[PDB]
Amino acid sequence: LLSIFISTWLTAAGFIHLVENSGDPWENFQNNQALTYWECVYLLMVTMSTVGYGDVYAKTTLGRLFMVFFILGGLAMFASYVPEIIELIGNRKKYGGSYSAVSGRKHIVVCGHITLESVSNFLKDFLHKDRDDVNVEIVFLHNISPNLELEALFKRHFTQVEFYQGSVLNPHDLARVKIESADACLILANKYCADPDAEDASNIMRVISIKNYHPKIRIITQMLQYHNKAHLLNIPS
Amino acid sequence: FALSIGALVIYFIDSSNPIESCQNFYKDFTLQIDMAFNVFFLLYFGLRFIAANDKLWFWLEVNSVVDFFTVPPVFVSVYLNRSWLGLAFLRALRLIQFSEILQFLNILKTSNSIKLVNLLSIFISTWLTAAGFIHLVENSGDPWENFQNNQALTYWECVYLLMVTMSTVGYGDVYAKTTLGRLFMVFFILGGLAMFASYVPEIIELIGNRKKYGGSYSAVSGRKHIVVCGHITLESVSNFLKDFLHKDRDDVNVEIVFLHNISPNLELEALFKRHFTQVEFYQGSVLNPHDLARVKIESADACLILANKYCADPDAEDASNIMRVISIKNYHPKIRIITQMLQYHNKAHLLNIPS
Amino acid sequence: VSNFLKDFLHKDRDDVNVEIVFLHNISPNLELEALFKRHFTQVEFYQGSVLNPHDLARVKIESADACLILANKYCADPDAEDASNIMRVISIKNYHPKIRIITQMLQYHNKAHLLNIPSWNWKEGDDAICLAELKLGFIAQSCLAQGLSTMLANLFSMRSFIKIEEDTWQKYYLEGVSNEMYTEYLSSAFVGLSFPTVCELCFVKLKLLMIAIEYKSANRESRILINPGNHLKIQEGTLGFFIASDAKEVKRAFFYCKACHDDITDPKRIKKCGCNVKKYDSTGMFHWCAPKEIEKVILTRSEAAMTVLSGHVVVCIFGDVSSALIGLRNLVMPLRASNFHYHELKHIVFVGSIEYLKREWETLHNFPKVSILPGTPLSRADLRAVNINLCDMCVILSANQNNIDDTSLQDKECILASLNIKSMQFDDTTGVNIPIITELVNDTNVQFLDQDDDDDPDTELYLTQPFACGTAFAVSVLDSLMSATYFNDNILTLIRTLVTGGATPELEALIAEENALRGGYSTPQTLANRDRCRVAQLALLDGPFADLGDGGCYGDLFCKALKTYNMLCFGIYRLRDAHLSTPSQCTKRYVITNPPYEFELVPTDLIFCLMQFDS
Ligand SMILES: CC(C)CCC[C@@H](C)[C@H]1CC[C@H]2[C@@H]3CC=C4C[C@@H](O)CC[C@]4(C)[C@H]3CC[C@]12C
Ligand SMILES: CC(C)CCC[C@@H](C)[C@H]1CC[C@H]2[C@@H]3CC=C4C[C@@H](O)CC[C@]4(C)[C@H]3CC[C@]12C
Ligand SMILES: [K+]
Ligand SMILES: [K+]
Ligand SMILES: [K+]
Ligand SMILES: [K+]
Ligand SMILES: [K+]
């Protein structure tokens, strides 16, 4: 794209330079304008950005005709190439990247069923005004992008709460949120599910993944059914 | 329409003359030709008028009003033996019907091309008539100042001025100096911006939605290709490409062409872009022989059919894969096929195909 | 829409100045938009509902020539779709009672509701095309004589003629596809003459094949008579149905006069210058038996193996306990017509899920010889237990008319079933010679049923070997019938009276009243009503026409059959590899509709004919 833009710019400038310096053929070449090539490059750039200073312009009839056609063609080509410009701009990631480990600042990784109500209750109790000053940050990890209410809640606590899109079962995402240096991992559960046993198995598998990545981390999990917690004794870590 | 074009050319020639001058009708035959054109237009107007269901709505038709401002000036000119430039540029509006003429001549058939020709014709006609208005006003001068504000602008310089203005460039080398000229330029800027804003949706529609995975595979000489179809998702394609395109694998000049009627998502698009030098994708169905011809299945080395391992009914998936095999062998019976089968009892159906 | 526009806006169709306006409250997708843009000079679309009178006023329904209502063939509940279409008919007739309406009906029992609308005038052109009834009647008549469905479909569909110079079968076949069906008023010179005499005169002199007439009486309404015997005489102003290549030549039947046209033999020179036990049902037109429970017809595999079935019909069904009903009665009613003797009736064996068949047995338990083999059509054991190698016809039907992610995949079952039967081996030798009819949702799949073919993939439906041989039935041809119904309303009536087996409106009313077939004691009136004509095929190997079939002309056979046995021959079912000098083992045959007088015969030919009933 850059090469085609530069090439058409340079060739249009050269053509305008030739036409302007040559003069009108039917008037015995008495309409010549002493324009250098680079002044014509400057003229083309000023025209195609729709600025139009008017300090330099084409005076010959052929020069003006070709400037009109160049304006038409340039607008048409830009309109045609807009979709490629949008594609190259693309869709910027919003919740990518990795957590930055601030020295002297512990962080807690929160995962599981992350929605408005559970996060709101946990943040309401955790970040209390009467709570003693604790230098602990909270990092949420979840592979469903937050909605408007969750985004507003995160923006309200933007100085202490970060969010990232990823899966706990993926070790790359675990490395992204610096789980190897987290003080603790807190796993929330979906209290409103068709099958509590499936949710319990999913949470136990998340515990297995986290303890596989780093066996020394502290984990606090939510369990729905009582008989499912015995599975946690089957994990050696 | 041809006579309208001729009258427009007559106006173009006449614009290079003083805007009001005495002349003899019998001395120059160009004025006679214009008179014949105008009386033909009057006859056509009368023919339309005598066969009009509604008088008022026909009276407000753009053809009627453009004929109203053309032939009475030429009548007064031939009666007074003196010609004034007038509003002849309005004849350019007769170019709007140009697309319809082409249709009668059966030159245009598709609807999109007809709409494009209509849009180009309306743009050109309004450009030319606005330039004509500006030229007339600028050369005439202000009426209340005894026409002492005349600016010697040719018609084509006014066309250039309109083009430079409407692209929002504005060199300032040529501009309107009279009061009426500046007023008309302000109104023209307002109207042009409004019309462009109104016509943006049609511009987007004519640009349309460009196909992303259409077209046909190009057969590179000396380069075999393998056609892969079936259940194409991230995991199956990732595993197959991981084993097939191994770094330690011996150098093989084989390309891979995927054919699938569901467009890929972001992960598949990224995976295809990573292997863009050896992997191509196309949108289509194996059961459609046109899509089979698109991917050049008649010259493929082999066809590989992947199965959806994760389905409610394995027998339905097996039947679908067997039917895909039937379609491929119907198109080209000599191609080699490697398929994935879910259930063991379903593969006996493959013995029912003689190919 | 694609099928309807393909048949309606045919290039070979005569110039008609008719525009088409679609009204639908779902916006079209990209493919429909492209199709509309392709026909933008003749097709318009509007968003609205038929049930809204404002939308009806928008499309100028008060000045429309006709309203055509298409049905969703692929729905969970056919009865809901039928009720919706009937309500649309009610709305349209409420807005304008004088408009002509042609509607599509899914189930047969739902069309009686159309008689409850006072504005519904059947005599003025209002018609309902029942998809299930017509399709299963076509299949049943093809069971009686294979290839009849192809002949009928080519007889009312516009087909472009292609000239073939090489000696192939497509040449002989493409000759007949040109034929069409017309209706004309017989000339006053034909009054007082028997039907065979007029038919022979039309065939020899005017080169027209007259199939049926419309007989009027004071006691009853007008009734279509298919090839009546010599006892009947032509009355005044009787409509006749002709099969002809050109529409202009049909007028010769109306302008014929013996004074100045009998001397001339050339049809081109003809001008307009005149000069104790219940065995049948209440109406006596169908075989009837006392109702029996489903337990008395279910056969186990061993029990079906013990009995020997030969010359029977095997209906393989891909049913389900939740799938939509297909109305199997419309398949069994034509096969149980009263014009067949009891010993000529073909045993019917249904192979499929018993859960589906229990829902259909309520309308099938009054017919004499019907058996059930619970199982699946895809098992070779069940097909061997039912003697599939000795059946007269195998009919593969798919009840699972539910929508699938891919439209073509809807035919995944039946095709495999066909490919199973063609691959079986038998010993006293292969399944390729077993006659099979398969319904097909997609036309593009028709070439999947045959492998011994050289058809290129862009071959049209009517030129493929499975279609030309009658071994495949495509439902899309019914979508053409509606268009053929618009230009002529008698075509549908003739097709119904030729295909369904003779369902009189009195029987329609009785079935509407009771939703069942009622038996009745035999009376001379019913026994007289029994005498009709039936579709049959004849071989020239050892019949009375054996000598004439060895190189003779078709016209001599036609004249001799019509003069002697009152038999109406209207087509040749000809072995595909008959024009080749080298011998072949292929038993496939194709359809030649209405061959000319000078057409040559070969001993390996079958003749379509209309048999009279005799006792
Ligand atoms: C695709 C491209 C290359 C084709 C376009 C033709 C171009 C290159 C031609 C056509 C007419 C030509 C002009 C005609 C007359 C003259 C006068 C003389 O002093 C030479 C240069 C000049 C000013 C020419 C420059 C080049 C030119 C504009
Ligand atoms: C729909 C359109 C046609 C109607 C608009 C009216 C236009 C055509 C009228 C209204 C005012 C008029 C102007 C009024 C005064 C003069 C001064 C004199 O030298 C004649 C031309 C000129 C400059 C006129 C040109 C035509 C004009 C602009
Ligand atoms: K600008
Ligand atoms: K400017
Ligand atoms: K500017
Ligand atoms: K400026
Ligand atoms: K036909």
Side-chain angles (χ1 to χ4, degrees):
Chain A
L1 193 143
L2 272 295
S3 65
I4 189 170
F5 165 73
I6 289 178
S7 54
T8 186
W9 183 12
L10 290 187
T11 187
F15 183 76
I16 291 300
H17 163 88
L18 174 64
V19 173
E20 281 305 298
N21 281 263
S22 178
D24 275 341
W26 51 85
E27 293 180 354
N28 291 318
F29 313 101
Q30 307 297 322
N31 294 28
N32 57 329
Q33 185 183 9
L35 288 171
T36 81
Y37 175 76
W38 307 106
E39 274 175 6
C40 298
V41 178
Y42 170 73
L43 167 60
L44 267 294
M45 183 49 182
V46 165
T47 297
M48 292 298 152
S49 53
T50 75
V51 173
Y53 284 122
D55 50 353
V56 288
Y57 51 89
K59 286 178 172 70
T60 71
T61 298
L62 288 174
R64 293 181 166 179
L65 183 66
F66 287 123
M67 283 304 302
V68 160
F69 288 145
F70 285 160
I71 285 171
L72 270 175
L75 292 200
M77 290 178 70
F78 174 73
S80 295
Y81 272 93
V82 160
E84 287 82 3
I85 294 318
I86 303 177
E87 163 186 349
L88 267 69
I89 290 184
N91 288 283
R92 178 65 66 192
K93 58 95 176 178
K94 193 174 183 180
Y95 300 112
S98 82
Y99 169 76
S100 86
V102 176
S103 179
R105 199 145 183 261
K106 306 175 181 179
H107 65 118
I108 297 301
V109 176
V110 179
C111 48
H113 178 75
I114 290 181
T115 49
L116 177 63
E117 185 176 1
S118 55
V119 165
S120 72
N121 287 125
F122 173 67
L123 288 188
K124 189 185 291 183
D125 199 86
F126 200 89
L127 306 164
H128 202 257
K129 53 170 184 178
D130 287 13
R131 169 95 62 190
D132 189 47
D133 50 352
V134 287
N135 189 32
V136 172
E137 195 168 27
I138 312 172
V139 176
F140 293 83
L141 183 54
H142 200 41
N143 53 1
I144 296 90
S145 65
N147 52 358
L148 274 298
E149 304 87 340
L150 275 171
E151 278 175 352
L153 181 53
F154 290 152
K155 277 175 187 174
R156 186 141 55 258
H157 306 286
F158 78 105
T159 184
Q160 287 151 318
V161 165
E162 305 187 6
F163 181 84
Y164 296 94
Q165 181 139 5
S167 166
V168 176
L169 302 169
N170 180 30
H172 183 37
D173 294 328
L174 290 176
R176 281 212 281 129
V177 294
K178 313 297 177 177
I179 197 74
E180 72 267 1
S181 65
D183 205 31
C185 196
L186 270 63
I187 309 189
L188 314 169
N190 190 3
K191 315 182 185 189
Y192 325 107
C193 52
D195 200 6
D197 278 14
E199 185 65 39
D200 278 352
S202 301
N203 286 333
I204 289 157
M205 187 175 177
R206 291 187 170 90
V207 172
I208 287 160
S209 170
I210 294 153
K211 285 279 177 172
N212 188 75
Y213 193 95
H214 193 231
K216 279 300 176 298
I217 194 178
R218 180 196 184 191
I219 299 187
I220 311 172
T221 178
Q222 260 175 353
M223 205 62 86
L224 295 190
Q225 282 314 304
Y226 162 76
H227 49 85
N228 287 318
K229 71 195 290 185
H231 290 310
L232 290 182
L233 297 190
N234 294 335
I235 305 154
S237 298
Chain B
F1 186 79
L3 297 184
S4 293
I5 300 299
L8 198 57
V9 174
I10 289 281
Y11 162 71
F12 285 171
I13 294 164
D14 204 6
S15 77
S16 175
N17 286 354
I19 78 163
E20 188 171 2
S21 196
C22 61
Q23 84 291 334
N24 178 231
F25 178 75
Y26 310 83
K27 222 195 166 177
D28 179 42
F29 73 103
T30 79
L31 176 61
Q32 307 167 12
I33 288 173
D34 201 7
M35 189 67 202
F37 284 14
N38 288 135
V39 299
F40 182 78
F41 293 147
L42 178 57
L43 289 181
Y44 176 68
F45 166 59
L47 184 63
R48 298 215 321 283
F49 180 52
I50 61 178
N53 53 3
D54 196 6
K55 300 289 94 176
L56 190 140
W57 269 51
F58 168 76
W59 201 258
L60 271 299
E61 165 196 13
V62 296
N63 294 113
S64 78
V65 67
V66 74
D67 297 335
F68 283 167
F69 281 99
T70 301
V71 301
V74 77
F75 286 166
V76 177
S77 165
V78 66
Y79 183 75
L80 271 300
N81 277 263
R82 59 180 302 182
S83 76
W84 176 59
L85 193 61
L87 310 176
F89 45 85
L90 289 173
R91 297 163 190 179
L93 294 171
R94 296 157 181 176
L95 273 57
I96 293 184
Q97 315 166 182
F98 173 53
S99 61
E100 298 185 359
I101 301 301
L102 297 180
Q103 185 176 2
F104 306 133
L105 310 177
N106 194 9
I107 310 178
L108 280 300
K109 295 179 181 181
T110 58
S111 184
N112 289 319
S113 66
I114 287 180
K115 188 194 298 186
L116 175 80
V117 168
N118 204 32
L119 193 143
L120 272 295
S121 65
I122 188 171
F123 166 73
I124 289 177
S125 54
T126 186
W127 183 12
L128 290 187
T129 188
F133 270 101
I134 287 301
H135 163 88
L136 174 63
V137 173
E138 282 306 297
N139 281 263
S140 159
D142 275 341
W144 51 87
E145 290 182 354
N146 290 318
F147 313 101
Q148 307 297 322
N149 294 28
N150 57 329
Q151 185 183 6
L153 288 172
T154 80
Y155 178 77
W156 307 105
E157 273 174 6
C158 298
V159 178
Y160 169 73
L161 167 60
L162 267 294
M163 183 49 181
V164 167
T165 298
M166 289 301 149
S167 53
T168 76
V169 173
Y171 285 123
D173 49 353
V174 289
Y175 50 88
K177 286 179 172 70
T178 72
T179 297
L180 290 174
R182 286 172 163 166
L183 182 78
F184 288 167
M185 293 299 291
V186 160
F187 283 165
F188 286 159
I189 286 170
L190 272 175
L193 291 203
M195 263 181 39
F196 174 73
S198 295
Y199 273 95
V200 159
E202 287 82 3
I203 294 318
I204 302 177
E205 161 185 350
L206 267 68
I207 290 185
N209 289 286
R210 178 65 65 192
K211 58 95 176 179
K212 192 173 183 180
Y213 300 112
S216 82
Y217 170 75
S218 86
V220 177
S221 179
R223 199 145 181 261
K224 307 175 181 179
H225 64 118
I226 298 302
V227 174
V228 179
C229 49
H231 178 75
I232 290 181
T233 49
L234 178 63
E235 183 175 1
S236 55
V237 164
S238 72
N239 287 125
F240 173 67
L241 289 188
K242 188 184 291 184
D243 199 86
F244 199 89
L245 304 164
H246 202 257
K247 52 170 184 178
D248 286 14
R249 169 95 62 190
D250 189 47
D251 50 352
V252 287
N253 188 36
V254 173
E255 195 167 28
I256 313 172
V257 176
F258 293 82
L259 182 53
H260 195 196
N261 52 1
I262 294 91
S263 65
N265 52 359
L266 274 298
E267 304 87 340
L268 286 172
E269 276 177 350
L271 182 53
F272 290 152
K273 277 174 187 174
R274 185 141 55 258
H275 306 286
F276 78 105
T277 184
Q278 287 152 318
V279 165
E280 305 186 6
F281 180 84
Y282 294 94
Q283 182 143 6
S285 167
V286 175
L287 301 169
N288 179 28
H290 183 36
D291 293 328
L292 291 179
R294 281 213 282 129
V295 294
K296 314 297 177 177
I297 198 73
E298 74 269 1
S299 64
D301 205 31
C303 196
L304 270 63
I305 309 189
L306 314 173
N308 190 3
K309 316 182 185 189
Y310 295 97
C311 54
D313 200 7
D315 279 17
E317 184 65 39
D318 277 349
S320 301
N321 286 333
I322 289 157
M323 187 175 177
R324 290 186 170 90
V325 172
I326 287 159
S327 170
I328 294 153
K329 285 279 177 172
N330 188 74
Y331 193 96
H332 194 231
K334 281 299 176 297
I335 193 178
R336 181 195 184 190
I337 299 187
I338 312 172
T339 178
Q340 259 175 353
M341 205 62 86
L342 296 190
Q343 283 313 304
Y344 163 76
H345 49 85
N346 287 319
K347 71 196 289 185
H349 291 310
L350 290 183
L351 297 190
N352 294 335
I353 304 154
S355 298
Chain C
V1 165
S2 72
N3 287 125
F4 173 67
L5 288 188
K6 188 185 291 183
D7 199 85
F8 199 89
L9 304 165
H10 202 256
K11 53 170 184 177
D12 287 13
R13 170 95 63 190
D14 189 47
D15 50 351
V16 288
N17 190 32
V18 172
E19 195 168 28
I20 312 172
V21 176
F22 293 83
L23 183 54
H24 202 219
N25 53 1
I26 296 89
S27 65
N29 52 358
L30 274 298
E31 305 88 340
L32 275 171
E33 278 176 351
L35 182 53
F36 290 152
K37 277 174 187 174
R38 186 141 54 258
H39 306 286
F40 78 105
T41 184
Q42 287 152 318
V43 165
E44 305 187 6
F45 180 84
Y46 296 94
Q47 181 139 5
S49 166
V50 176
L51 301 170
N52 181 30
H54 183 36
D55 293 328
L56 290 176
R58 281 213 282 129
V59 294
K60 314 297 177 177
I61 198 73
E62 73 268 1
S63 64
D65 205 30
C67 196
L68 270 63
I69 309 189
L70 314 169
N72 190 4
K73 315 182 185 189
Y74 294 96
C75 54
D77 200 6
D79 278 14
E81 184 65 39
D82 277 351
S84 301
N85 286 333
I86 289 157
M87 187 175 177
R88 290 187 170 90
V89 173
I90 287 161
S91 170
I92 294 153
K93 285 279 177 172
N94 188 74
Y95 193 96
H96 194 230
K98 281 300 177 298
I99 194 178
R100 180 196 184 190
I101 299 187
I102 311 172
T103 178
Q104 260 175 354
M105 205 62 86
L106 295 190
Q107 282 313 304
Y108 162 76
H109 49 85
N110 287 318
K111 71 195 290 185
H113 290 310
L114 290 183
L115 297 190
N116 294 335
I117 305 154
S119 298
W120 183 266
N121 206 329
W122 171 87
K123 297 178 177 65
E124 290 292 327
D126 298 315
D127 283 327
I129 295 164
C130 191
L131 303 180
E133 173 206 32
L134 280 184
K135 154 173 69 180
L136 292 196
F138 274 39
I139 294 180
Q141 295 304 318
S142 297
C143 289
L144 296 167
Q146 201 174 5
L148 192 62
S149 65
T150 286
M151 182 181 287
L152 293 183
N154 284 354
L155 205 55
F156 61 73
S157 302
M158 282 289 180
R159 311 290 200 190
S160 62
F161 179 53
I162 298 170
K163 179 59 63 180
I164 302 300
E165 67 272 15
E166 44 182 352
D167 192 15
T168 59
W169 65 268
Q170 289 90 328
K171 69 180 285 70
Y172 310 100
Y173 167 82
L174 275 179
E175 297 171 1
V177 306
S178 62
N179 288 78
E180 292 177 351
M181 191 184 309
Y182 307 99
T183 71
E184 201 56 73
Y185 276 99
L186 260 55
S187 77
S188 75
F190 287 138
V191 71
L193 299 169
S194 83
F195 180 87
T197 296
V198 184
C199 196
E200 182 177 281
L201 274 187
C202 285
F203 186 73
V204 172
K205 301 287 160 36
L206 313 177
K207 312 209 165 199
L208 303 163
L209 179 59
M210 182 175 69
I211 288 301
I213 59 172
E214 187 176 2
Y215 204 62
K216 303 190 181 187
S217 296
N219 292 318
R220 321 173 189 181
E221 298 174 349
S222 72
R223 196 172 71 256
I224 298 193
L225 292 183
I226 313 289
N227 190 53
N230 51 352
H231 68 271
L232 200 75
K233 260 75 183 192
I234 302 287
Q235 300 173 336
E236 181 68 29
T238 68
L239 203 56
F241 299 82
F242 303 91
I243 300 181
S245 305
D246 180 30
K248 183 174 71 68
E249 302 160 346
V250 192
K251 298 295 289 183
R252 300 200 200 102
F254 177 71
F255 293 114
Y256 181 77
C257 59
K258 194 182 175 170
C260 65
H261 293 113
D262 194 16
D263 292 331
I264 176 61
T265 317
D266 180 30
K268 178 179 182 178
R269 276 170 193 176
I270 305 302
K271 304 174 183 179
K272 306 180 179 183
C273 178
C275 191
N276 52 2
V277 61
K278 303 175 176 182
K279 288 179 183 174
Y280 311 95
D281 68 328
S282 74
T283 192
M285 295 180 73
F286 290 95
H287 282 277
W288 194 84
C289 77
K292 44 182 71 163
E293 294 177 350
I294 198 166
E295 329 293 329
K296 293 181 176 66
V297 301
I298 293 180
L299 304 176
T300 69
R301 191 175 298 171
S302 174
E303 200 174 350
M306 292 298 105
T307 183
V308 163
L309 300 160
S310 69
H312 60 296
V313 178
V314 178
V315 187
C316 309
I317 300 166
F318 290 91
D320 185 27
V321 73
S322 59
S323 53
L325 293 189
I326 64 175
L328 290 167
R329 185 171 65 189
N330 303 303
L331 177 70
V332 194
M333 276 209 89
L335 293 171
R336 291 296 176 268
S338 188
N339 61 6
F340 307 122
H341 291 84
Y342 194 76
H343 71 270
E344 301 183 357
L345 291 182
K346 294 180 183 179
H347 202 116
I348 304 182
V349 186
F350 290 102
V351 173
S353 170
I354 192 71
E355 287 313 298
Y356 175 80
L357 279 156
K358 285 174 72 175
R359 309 160 45 188
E360 288 254 0
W361 186 248
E362 186 67 27
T363 77
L364 267 74
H365 56 78
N366 292 113
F367 295 105
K369 289 175 289 190
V370 169
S371 309
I372 309 286
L373 177 62
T376 183
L378 276 178
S379 64
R380 295 197 170 188
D382 292 341
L383 301 175
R384 280 199 161 81
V386 75
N387 284 323
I388 198 79
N389 49 315
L390 308 181
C391 70
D392 278 334
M393 191 65 47
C394 185
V395 174
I396 310 175
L397 297 174
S398 176
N400 295 115
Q401 295 297 109
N402 53 346
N403 193 0
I404 306 304
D405 305 358
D406 191 356
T407 303
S408 302
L409 283 181
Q410 295 214 12
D411 290 338
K412 62 187 175 195
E413 293 91 4
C414 290
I415 287 178
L416 271 68
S418 299
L419 293 198
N420 194 49
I421 299 178
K422 291 193 185 70
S423 286
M424 294 176 71
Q425 285 186 92
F426 311 93
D427 56 334
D428 290 346
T429 186
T430 175
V432 65
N433 290 333
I434 297 180
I436 300 169
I437 300 173
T438 312
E439 68 178 1
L440 290 170
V441 167
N442 292 50
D443 303 345
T444 61
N445 300 352
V446 69
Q447 46 192 0
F448 293 167
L449 297 177
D450 183 19
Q451 293 82 18
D452 189 16
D453 50 356
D454 54 353
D455 309 349
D456 51 3
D458 61 357
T459 301
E460 304 184 9
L461 169 61
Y462 82 103
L463 284 171
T464 63
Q465 288 193 0
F467 190 88
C469 294
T471 73
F473 185 81
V475 305
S476 68
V477 306
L478 296 185
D479 282 351
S480 81
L481 187 42
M482 181 178 286
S483 80
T485 313
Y486 168 64
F487 300 100
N488 201 348
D489 53 279
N490 308 115
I491 304 312
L492 183 63
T493 312
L494 180 73
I495 285 163
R496 275 195 69 252
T497 193
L498 183 69
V499 161
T500 65
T504 64
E506 162 194 351
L507 177 83
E508 300 284 328
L510 284 161
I511 293 174
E513 272 283 347
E514 312 165 353
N515 204 354
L517 196 60
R518 179 211 317 174
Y521 294 102
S522 296
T523 62
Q525 296 91 341
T526 59
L527 298 186
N529 203 3
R530 175 181 193 191
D531 174 36
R532 284 171 280 162
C533 290
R534 70 186 181 276
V535 173
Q537 276 179 350
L538 289 176
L540 306 171
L541 284 174
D542 51 347
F545 321 104
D547 52 352
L548 188 54
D550 192 14
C553 64
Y554 174 77
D556 197 9
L557 171 63
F558 178 88
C559 285
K560 190 181 180 308
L562 191 52
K563 195 181 308 301
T564 311
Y565 312 98
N566 280 3
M567 189 184 293
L568 199 57
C569 313
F570 60 100
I572 292 172
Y573 195 66
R574 175 176 284 251
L575 199 62
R576 175 180 69 109
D577 290 340
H579 61 283
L580 304 181
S581 69
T582 176
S584 167
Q585 297 296 287
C586 191
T587 47
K588 285 161 74 163
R589 301 171 168 265
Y590 60 99
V591 173
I592 309 167
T593 310
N594 191 38
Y597 198 98
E598 62 269 356
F599 198 81
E600 287 178 349
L601 294 184
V602 294
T604 52
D605 264 355
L606 299 185
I607 305 300
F608 291 96
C609 50
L610 297 157
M611 292 293 175
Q612 312 271 339
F613 177 81
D614 46 351
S615 64

Coordinates of all heavy atoms in Angstrom, one line a residue, chain A residues 196-197 200 222-230:
Chain A
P196 N -25.3 -28.4 39.4 CA -24.2 -28.0 40.3 C -23.0 -28.9 40.2 O -21.9 -28.4 40.5 CB -24.9 -28.1 41.7 CG -26.4 -28.1 41.4 CD -26.5 -28.7 40.0
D197 N -23.1 -30.1 39.9 CA -22.0 -31.0 39.9 C -21.0 -30.7 38.7 O -19.8 -30.8 38.9 CB -22.4 -32.5 39.7 CG -22.8 -33.1 41.1 OD1 -23.0 -32.3 42.0 OD2 -23.0 -34.3 41.1
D200 N -19.1 -27.7 40.0 CA -18.1 -28.2 41.0 C -16.9 -28.9 40.3 O -15.7 -28.6 40.7 CB -18.7 -29.1 42.0 CG -19.5 -28.3 43.1 OD1 -19.3 -27.1 43.1 OD2 -20.2 -29.0 43.9
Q222 N -14.9 -21.6 46.0 CA -16.3 -21.8 46.4 C -16.9 -23.1 45.8 O -16.7 -23.4 44.6 CB -17.2 -20.6 45.8 CG -17.5 -19.6 46.9 CD -18.2 -18.4 46.3 OE1 -18.4 -18.3 45.1 NE2 -18.7 -17.5 47.2
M223 N -17.5 -23.9 46.7 CA -18.1 -25.2 46.3 C -19.6 -25.2 46.5 O -20.1 -24.7 47.5 CB -17.4 -26.3 47.1 CG -17.5 -27.7 46.4 SD -16.5 -27.7 44.9 CE -14.9 -28.1 45.5
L224 N -20.3 -25.7 45.5 CA -21.7 -25.7 45.6 C -22.3 -26.9 46.4 O -23.0 -26.7 47.4 CB -22.3 -25.8 44.2 CG -22.1 -24.6 43.3 CD1 -22.9 -24.6 42.0 CD2 -22.3 -23.3 44.0
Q225 N -21.9 -28.1 46.1 CA -22.4 -29.3 46.8 C -21.3 -29.8 47.7 O -20.1 -29.6 47.5 CB -22.8 -30.4 45.8 CG -24.1 -30.2 45.1 CD -25.2 -29.8 46.1 OE1 -25.5 -30.5 47.1 NE2 -25.8 -28.7 45.8
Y226 N -21.8 -30.4 48.8 CA -20.9 -30.8 49.9 C -20.1 -32.0 49.6 O -18.9 -32.1 49.9 CB -21.7 -31.0 51.2 CG -21.0 -31.8 52.3 CD1 -20.0 -31.2 53.0 CD2 -21.3 -33.1 52.5 CE1 -19.4 -31.9 54.0 CE2 -20.7 -33.9 53.4 CZ -19.7 -33.3 54.2 OH -19.1 -34.0 55.2
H227 N -20.7 -32.9 48.8 CA -20.0 -34.2 48.5 C -18.9 -34.0 47.5 O -18.1 -34.9 47.4 CB -21.0 -35.2 48.1 CG -21.9 -34.7 47.0 ND1 -21.6 -34.7 45.6 CD2 -23.2 -34.2 47.1 CE1 -22.6 -34.2 44.9 NE2 -23.5 -33.9 45.8
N228 N -18.9 -32.9 46.8 CA -17.9 -32.7 45.8 C -16.6 -32.2 46.3 O -15.6 -32.2 45.6 CB -18.4 -31.7 44.7 CG -19.5 -32.3 43.8 OD1 -19.3 -33.4 43.4 ND2 -20.5 -31.5 43.6
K229 N -16.5 -31.7 47.5 CA -15.3 -31.1 48.1 C -14.2 -32.2 48.4 O -13.1 -31.9 48.6 CB -15.6 -30.2 49.3 CG -16.0 -31.0 50.5 CD -16.6 -30.0 51.5 CE -15.6 -29.1 52.1 NZ -16.1 -28.2 53.2
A230 N -14.7 -33.4 48.6 CA -13.7 -34.5 48.9 C -12.8 -34.7 47.7 O -11.6 -35.2 48.0 CB -14.5 -35.8 49.2

